[PDB]
Design a protein around this ligand. Structure first.
Ligand SMILES: [Mg+2]
Ligand SMILES: [Mg+2]
Ligand SMILES: [Mg+2]
Ligand SMILES: [Mg+2]
Ligand SMILES: [Mg+2]
Ligand SMILES: [Mg+2]
Ligand SMILES: [Mg+2]
Lengths: 130, 130, 131
């Protein structure tokens, strides 16, 4: 039983990994809120989804890509000329081997720190085990 | 086998619970389209996801939060200065006990009434039973 | 039975055509066809599908992307921005499917973004339960 769901507390920017440290669910402790990465332990098929809210009132564009190890497996953008709140979200189904790391990487722009509202989220779970 | 998927027919506003009464799937009849809430019967881990379309041509901001019982477990915002259509969407994986209610509540703003087109949606299913 | 797929959009789409997600990352069992952009059901049961369609930026203000079962709209989504900014038409569904049923993502007006290999616009899904 592998499943996790965490939210983003603090604001982020640039090209850094998003540390979702508002952890709500973490069966097996395979997600690390100190690095914001999900480490695969059992080979198999996994679903991941992420929602990243852009910082409002400061900036027009923000990118958030889901990476496996050091390869982009999903890309997303939030854009608005009037600096409005908008979401960079995406979902993936991937096969993972032991040691594989899955995380959400910013690719430019500013993310919102939602404190306790859990605006920016990272969630996932194993569908099938090999 | 617990799983459901329902859409929103009527427009909503303010801070009311979103009653997705255009029901497509409801294994176990655990979702109530009359209250718009999903009642847990078996303790375990559950996936939920929601997409709420903002009312266009009237208002600039709309909030939609996924609440468990009476606690926010996900927040979302749609915002556009030009009153354009935009989405407040989010997903969660949570542990649930029997009697727990999970639903999508507006937290300010105006929601779009999509009739039968299923623009605004709420779906979910159990991953693991304890 | 392990039934699951996840594909991204390489080329641009527009009008009212089905989105051919031809950047396939996962396709256990080959029930999704990237040449038609359709998921054909073989095993009766309950399936989760989700799609994210990025609107084309700098050209157009509105875009629709609907998830269709057979030839029936089972989910609709819109992306809109007056300043022609990037925005998403995304949605998720849980549906019961019989063998032969086709599930795909169709544009319903507007222009979709071609992300090449970046996987900006995506279509994914998987079986939860088999009958
Ligand atoms: Mg927008
Ligand atoms: Mg990128
Ligand atoms: Mg404007
Ligand atoms: Mg709130
Ligand atoms: Mg606008
Ligand atoms: Mg968006
Ligand atoms: Mg339509």
């Amino acid at each position: 039983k592998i499943a996790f769901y965490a939210g983003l507390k603090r604001q982020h920017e640039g090209y850094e990994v998003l540390k979702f440290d508002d952890v709500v669910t973490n069966l097996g402790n395979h997600y690390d809120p100190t690095t914001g990465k999900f480490t695969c332990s059992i080979p198999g098929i996994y679903f991941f989804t992420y929602h990243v809210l852009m910082r409002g009132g400061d900036g027009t564009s923000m990118w958030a890509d889901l990476c496996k190890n050091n390869q982009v497996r999903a890309s997303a953008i939030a854009q608005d000329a009037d600096q409005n709140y908008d979401y960079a979200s995406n979902s993936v189904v991937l096969h993972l081997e032991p040691g594989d790391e899955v995380y959400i990487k910013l690719d430019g722009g500013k993310a919102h720190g939602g404190n306790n509202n859990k605006y920016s989220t990272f969630s996932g779970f194993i569908i099938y085990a090999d």
